[model samples]
Target: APPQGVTVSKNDGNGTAILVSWQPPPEMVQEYKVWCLGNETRYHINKTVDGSTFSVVIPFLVPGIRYSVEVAASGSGVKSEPQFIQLD
Candidate 1:
């Protein structure tokens, strides 16, 4: 299953970076993938983390633009329904 309690916030050290956090799913997974896309700037980014990780930071985001983010879990060739969030 996908992670629960997925949330996004600004990074203290880098204002242009987004801090994404989540709680682990019930089932064990090999990895998590974070996806982000800017609505106005058309910027796109993807990040992958190991199974034990619960967070990721997306960098180089353009200011004054809204970005949509999604988080997904992958295990044994299967992926869970992604969680979604929006930020500017």
Candidate 2:
């Protein structure tokens, strides 16, 4: 499961990229996984973070699309509720 308070952060810049962050849930996780749904395709972020972290950055993105960050507690064989970050 993803940590609670997952949010799309505001860009101080013109809006080319954005930040995604969340508060750590009560449960302990091994590591965090970042997932996404964009352009009708699914992707697993190549990055992973330890339990102490609270945020991730999505950089160098081109326009004309929508992207969402889907965080997971760990590697899974199940699906939970739908959570997403709307690009705009």
Candidate 3:
């Protein structure tokens, strides 16, 4: 079966840094890939290990711009629902 669910934390716009977190699905043996919305495409941030939660502090984000995040399982290729959050 695919991973259960993924989630993103609240946005704290502190200049150029934003914190994000997610929960991996159960019985999955793949890492999680994090992506951020960019101009015309999504940019990859990093990958998290299996059975572990993901939290990242992204820098260089433009203020007052809307940003979104998405996560996908590494091996199984199960992608979670995208979560959108805006910075102010």
Candidate 4:
């Protein structure tokens, strides 16, 4: 089985970055994928670092809009629940 949890962090309106962190399922042989929702189709962070923190910046994100994130494993087929946030 794959790990089933994720941690997300973001900055305030004046800032320009969103941070994501997760732990891959033990014994799985694949990378992780991250997706961001809002103001665009969606962004993907392919092959994220294992056991380390990951982050992306939405330089064009508008203030007061909502954004959500989701993470999934490459193989083993496990996905985390969606984490949502709003730009302040």
Model 1: worst 10 consecutive residues (lDDT sum)? 75-84
Kindly indicate the candidate among 2 and 3 with the higher TM-score.
2
Of 1 and 2, which scores higher on TM-score?
1
Give a tens-digit lDDT track for model 2, residues 1-88.
Answer: 4477777664547776667677665535667666655666433334567777778876644454555566656563222234544444
What lDDT, from 0 to 1, does candidate 1 have?
Answer: 0.72
lDDT head-to-head 1 vs 2, winner: 1
Order candidates by TM-score, high to low.
1, 2, 3, 4
lDDT by residue (1-88, candidate 4, tens digit) is: 3345577766545585666666656653445566667656554333354434333343444457677777766643556777886666
Tens-digit lDDT track of model 1 for 6-87: 8888775635777888887764577888878775445888799998999898877777766777788773333344434443
Q: Which stretches of candidate 4 lie over 4 Å from their true place?
A: 1-3, 11-13, 39-60
Runs of candidate 1 with Cα error greater than 4 angstroms are: 40-42, 75-88
Per-structure clash totals for the candidates? 0, 0, 0, 1
Top TM-score model: 1
lDDT tens digits, residues 1-88, model 3?
3344455554454466666666656653446566677555444355455546566666766656677776676644756666776656
Q: Look at candidate 2 and give me any clashing residue pairs.
A: none
| 3 versus 4: better TM-score goes to | 3
Tell me each candidate's TM-score.
0.76, 0.68, 0.63, 0.62
Question: Which TM-score value belongs to model 4?
Answer: 0.62
lDDT score of residue 78 within candidate 4: 57
Better of 1 and 4 by TM-score: 1
